[PDB]
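Thought: the user asked what Major urinary protein 6 looks like in 3D. I have the sequence; next I should run the structure tool and report back without guessing.
Action: structure_tool
Action Input:
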Amino acid sequence: MGSSHHHHHHIEGREEASSTGRNFNVEKINGEWHTIILASDKREKIEDNGNFRLFLEQIHVLENSLVLKFHTVRDEECSELSMVADKTEKAGEYSVTYDGFNTFTIPKTDYDNFLMAHLINEKDGETFQLMGLYGREPDLSSDIKERFAQLCEEHGILRENIIDLSNANRCLQARE
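Observation:
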């Protein structure tokens, strides 16, 4: 018998990555975060006073896991919950303790400009693909916000299902 192999090279320039474990940097995403735009197949979910329509906090990068907090109201009263996204046997898919069985991952990690995450929750015999677009700033330009719209169509999430958050901000359910 007898075999042989070869080596590989790396890149220094700015290039995207995924949670799969290929040139991923969590030391960047670490810090004050913000929810630019929320896109997911479920307008009735990410709508006025929805359930997933919550703000993001500063993720705390740990040894292998990372803590994350959100902002959710209750009984017409502002509030916030506590979560902790950890690793699992899966491939580049973290597991966060949510109201129902779900998994938080990161398909497009462009901390340099805008970060992208993909979480799916399957409860009540029903599931949906959730994706929260994040960016170094509290608002993304028309050049970056469009980038996400290119992926939403790939996940089956029509560009129309994209709900703008930068324009929608409130902590009450007041209306006519």
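Thought: the tool returned a structure. Summarizing for the user.
Final Answer: Structure for Major urinary protein 6 predicted. The longest strand covers residues 126-135. Residues 145-152 form the longest helix (8 residues).
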